[PDB]
Amino acid sequence: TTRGFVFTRHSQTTAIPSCPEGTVPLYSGFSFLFVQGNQRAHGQDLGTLGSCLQRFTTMPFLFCNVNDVCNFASRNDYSYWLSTPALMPMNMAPITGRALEPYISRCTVCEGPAIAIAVHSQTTDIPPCPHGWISLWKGFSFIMFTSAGSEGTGQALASPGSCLEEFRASPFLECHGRGTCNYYSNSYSFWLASLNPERMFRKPIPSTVKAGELEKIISRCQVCMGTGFLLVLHSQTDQEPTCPLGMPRLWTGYSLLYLEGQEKAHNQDLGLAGSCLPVFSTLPFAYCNIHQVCHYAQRNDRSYWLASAAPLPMMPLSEEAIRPYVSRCAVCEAPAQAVAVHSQDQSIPPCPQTWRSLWIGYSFLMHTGAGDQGGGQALMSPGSCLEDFRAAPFLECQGRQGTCHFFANKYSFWLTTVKADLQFSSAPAPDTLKESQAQRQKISRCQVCVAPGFLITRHSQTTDAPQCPQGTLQVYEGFSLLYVQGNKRAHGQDLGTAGSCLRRFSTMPFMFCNINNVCNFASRNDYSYWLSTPEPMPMSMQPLKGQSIQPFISRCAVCEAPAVVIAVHSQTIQIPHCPQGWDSLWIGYSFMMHTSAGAEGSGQALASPGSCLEEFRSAPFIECHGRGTCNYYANSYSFWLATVDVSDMFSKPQSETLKAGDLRTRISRCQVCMKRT
Amino acid sequence: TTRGFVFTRHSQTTAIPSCPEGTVPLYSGFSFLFVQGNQRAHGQDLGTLGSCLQRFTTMPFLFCNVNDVCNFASRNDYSYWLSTPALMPMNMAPITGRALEPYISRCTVCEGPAIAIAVHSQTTDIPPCPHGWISLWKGFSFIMFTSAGSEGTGQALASPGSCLEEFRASPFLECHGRGTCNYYSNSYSFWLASLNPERMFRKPIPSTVKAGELEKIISRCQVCMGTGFLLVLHSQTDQEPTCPLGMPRLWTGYSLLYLEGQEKAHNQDLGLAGSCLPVFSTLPFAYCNIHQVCHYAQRNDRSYWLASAAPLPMMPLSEEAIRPYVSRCAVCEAPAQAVAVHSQDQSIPPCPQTWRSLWIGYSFLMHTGAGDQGGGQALMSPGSCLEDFRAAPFLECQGRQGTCHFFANKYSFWLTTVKADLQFSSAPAPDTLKESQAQRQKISRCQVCVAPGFLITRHSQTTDAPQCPQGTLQVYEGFSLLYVQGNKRAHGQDLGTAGSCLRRFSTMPFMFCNINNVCNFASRNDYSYWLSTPEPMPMSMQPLKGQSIQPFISRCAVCEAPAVVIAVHSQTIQIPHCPQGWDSLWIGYSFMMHTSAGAEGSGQALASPGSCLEEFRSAPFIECHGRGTCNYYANSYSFWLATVDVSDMFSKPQSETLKAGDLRTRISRCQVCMKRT
Ligand SMILES: [Cl-]
Ligand SMILES: [Cl-]
Ligand SMILES: [Cl-]
Ligand SMILES: [Cl-]
Ligand SMILES: [Cl-]
Ligand SMILES: [Cl-]
Ligand SMILES: [Cl-]
Ligand SMILES: [Cl-]
Ligand SMILES: [Cl-]
Ligand SMILES: [Cl-]
Ligand SMILES: [Cl-]
Ligand SMILES: [Cl-]
């Protein structure tokens, strides 16, 4: 019955969890939440296999530099794991060694015949599964978390990872490269709140709860399995959108862009059903601390939503005045996966023949709100294809104040057109565009299409386009885009997805727009980052410009596969076996995250082929700028999953500095696998 | 007896503190710690008059945008105040309204005949004052603090503000524009630790203490008054420097650059005695939480120190191996204040005649270490003039690990030479310099001189240089530098100091250097920011380049004054009176901080003339880039101290959005005053 749809279940105890009825176990492990390296957090969604590591260690990664030197457990980095209810020592000492085992949650990776999703009631009642869908488990609506330095990450709200079966004010441990784990007083968990749906557009009522009553303010959820895929539509108006003909509507709601707790953004991809919340609030979440206290509407947190085209307000909108400004959404049951295609051109890109066209739009890439926070869309996701271009596509809600507003620091970023024959030859030509039609003519266009198969991306890490893996068919060739950085905020593209493969290269493939309806292209200090090749730097070590950039940029192919493709990781020097019933596509090294300018960066999902780079490189990417230059920089860092022998589990990490020939002895291996059908 | 040397004393109770014997009170108020606006913290040193505000409110500032609109208490910003021992409600409810009064510490601003400094024992014993100096009070060694989003700030370690008379695990309250204040579980205080001086170069011993024993790990201090000024020397070698002839040596130590707690840097200016710590440690501090628990060496914090010229290590230096790599320092008693003069030229700038020359060096501007953290030097401070140029002038110590190392992401930033006759005409010419002599020839030179008077800076906010205020003499004219941003990290120059007045303009007045001994100028994506003029943007709204930049840049004058100059702020629409015995220099508006790209920014000290801008402007500064462009941007924000009527004190801030004609009705006024002699 199984067809390659893989999810994780977490016990939150020392017990290894059983797979739900109708699904089969692939392997079990320890519940891995996120890493924090060079002050940057990078997580693995709890519903995906990347959150289940077979080998526990307080330091599951290492980092490498442009001098071809790697450092393991030798600086001041962190890892975080879901915990059990085991009580900590009374003297508040940390735990080390094998004594850690009773404290770490266990997990099991399961394969099912169809996708598993989470649905949330946003009340204290358990929501029903969508009609026809089968219940896998019930739980509590878990969103995000922060710990050291207020760094953290979150769950996609339609992922099973957003539905924890046991409520915990303190669901996770902070661990150090030093070998210790503990709970700390700034370790915070964030949950969807139980809301009054009649008060959507009214000021939140503050509440503080203590042990014995914490669950009275927490939303409930179910994880459900049903055939088909989820298609998400955002109207960008105050009217609910209608589903494509033949696709049943599962629910409607309000277009959630991101939530911000303790000044840390947690975004929902607009193409995923977690971006469609049935119950709006200026503050749809609460947070809890390790002292078994939860606070709702007691500090300074906020929310961000896609906006309608109602006229810009001159001052914050209060309570009921908010309603006409929030975009609506629908979640529809589709027979296959929808993807966005982008042209980097004024012309609308056609859907491949036999692929059903759903809508056409403009290429929406990323956004920044208050502070240095923001987020962005996956270019392979329909959430990157908005039917209506808007310089100001989103609003901010001031949480407790019960208002929303468009403040002047809001930026939207859009993929731009690129002249096909001028690639490399010239620097981006800066421009400032003040009229909406002028702007629309410089923005990349897109079309959302239903694909009969699955798309994966492969990167050659050379100047030659790679071949697709056995049994797949090349769709197009391109250039390996790793991430972009706009207004200092980094936003990545999953290297296993088509957004990491742009058909046209530019050092500045996007522009930004403000609430004054003025857009600026290549006119500030922004970046693009690309996987790179073995090409050595010039002896002068000056940045490359123009045609001299070409030999440095990795190429890629997007490949059409007949079945689902995943990556698995051994955490050893051995190649991990593909799960039974899956066939090998390629092998590689476990690539997890990266940072460069301002220590901003992004990372890979371990479940994705993008986490399995076929050639290890201490310096796998090059940094480009809107002014038309590219170079390597001394603070460009790569992060890799580490090997963990049985003797490395639980014990103090053996800190080490490794030079060139001895690097890959500590790098985990991986295999990219495709379900056999 | 008084001669214009002004400091603050804090009671940490509801009692208004008396001034120490031999000093006279100027006014009293409430103990103000820092603001957090647009996710950026900006503090007022607790030893300075900026930490004593007469009118308490939970929202003492507002912010303004490039559309000439200001917003007061309408977003999600914070203020922080020193607290009393008053107990909070049992249900953990926040406090609002007049009920806040018993919780806010009081302060008194005092004038004395000479400077007041803090000295720290780094033990549980009280240190003696330097020989001949008079004790003002005793206390506990307070460094820094973090709260929401792990934002916070710190005290200069030779400031009286680093010596709190009562130890408190929870010394401060977090307040909101909403009108609430409370303690939160992530509100952390950081203190110098009690250290074993025999274990300076050994691994820290971890400790966790609870109520009743917290002070057993906390350093003690005294605040002392003595005639003369402090001169700080850094050898950049493992040998202690010798004081200039005629200047008694007060102490020697190790060159502290910055400390990092919860991933937040707190820097010590290298020209201030807080950068010279007698007792080295890889972790010289501990932290406490509001649950009356303090932790030493239990997490992942670190320290940074100036380095010697010993050869670069291939792996971290462990314990005793550290010693030859840490720079030494001396603190000397000087008869007048020493300042740095910079040439922006290969030629050494001469000391003004009659000013005593102390040393010559290279212009050291800023630095970045792990993550997005770092700091920098005031160009008027001798700490910006290092005798030996070093691409890698500082090292990082990994705290608990008991190691130090030079990792590849470390950057040093140096002020560069500027061709006098090429200003404005051409964009900066990018260059990559790989040889030390080549680098030294592109770096600005400096000389440290003893000045017989005091220097202040005035900004015209027009294209004309301003006149110096009455009774002062112009030293030079220049361009108004507000701050720089390198590797995304912002670093400001106090607008009341000569570092905010550069004789030569460039959009890129600095370069950066890495541990591979390679320096890069105008070759990445860095910024400079300048006070601006009334010049309107071009209709195209494209960035300015070349000679078109000139009409946008504010000019300044540096002025020599016969006596100390301060600013005072009314928090009302009325001009504050100068203190008795002080004469008026100019009046203005209370300018506190600013942010632009990435919401990075800097701010002003309320004690400084730099916090008193003579013309209010919603958009007082323009953003320039290393590529040679300048423009205004929609996220360029200014922050101003707000007016607080008696009816605004304690009560809920009356949130308001203000347009152009009604802006200054909510802007505090100020006066710049000079001691009459
Ligand atoms: Cl580490
Ligand atoms: Cl803690
Ligand atoms: Cl809140
Ligand atoms: Cl604004
Ligand atoms: Cl740019
Ligand atoms: Cl570099
Ligand atoms: Cl506010
Ligand atoms: Cl809390
Ligand atoms: Cl620590
Ligand atoms: Cl490194
Ligand atoms: Cl630059
Ligand atoms: Cl802008």
Numbering used by the authors:
A (entry chain A), B (entry chain A): 2 to 678
According to the publication:
The single-chain α345 NC1 trimer produced recombinantly in stably transfected HEK293 cells was purified to homogeneity and crystallized in the presence of sodium chloride. The crystal structure was solved at the 1.76 Å resolution with a single polypeptide chain per asymmetric unit. It has the designed orientation of α chains in the order of α3-to-α4-to-α5. The atomic structure is homologous to the crystal structure of the α121 NC1 domain, which is also homologous to all reported crystal structures of tissue extracted from the human and bovine α121 NC1 domain. Based on sulfilimine cross-linking analysis of the GBM α345 hexamer, the expected chain pairs were α3–α5 and α4–α4 (7), although in the crystal structure, we observed α3–α3 and α4–α5 pairs. Thus, the present crystal structure of the α345 hexamer demonstrates a labile nature of a trimer–trimer orientation in the hexamer before sulfilimine cross-linking. Despite rotational mismatch of the crystallized hexamer, we discovered a set of twelve Cl- ions at the trimer–trimer interface having the same geometry as in the α121 hexamer. Geometry and residue specificity of Cl- coordination are identical between α345 and α121, with only one exception, that is, two-thirds of group 1 ions (four ions per hexamer) are not coordinated by the salt bridge to the arginine residue of the opposite trimer, rather identical arginine within the same trimer coordinates respective ions (Cl- ions #1–2). The central inner cavity going from one trimer to another through the hexamer interface accommodates multiple structured PEG molecules but would accommodate much larger molecules if present during protein folding or the hexamer assembly.
The collagen IVα345 scaffold, composed of the α3, α4, and α5 chains, is a major constituent of the GBM. The crystal structure of the hexamer revealed a ring of 12 chloride ions that, together with up to six sulfilimine bonds, stabilizes the hexamer structure. The α345 hexamer harbors a number of structural features associated with pathology, which are located within the LCL sites where pathogenic mechanisms of AS and GP converge, and potentially DN.
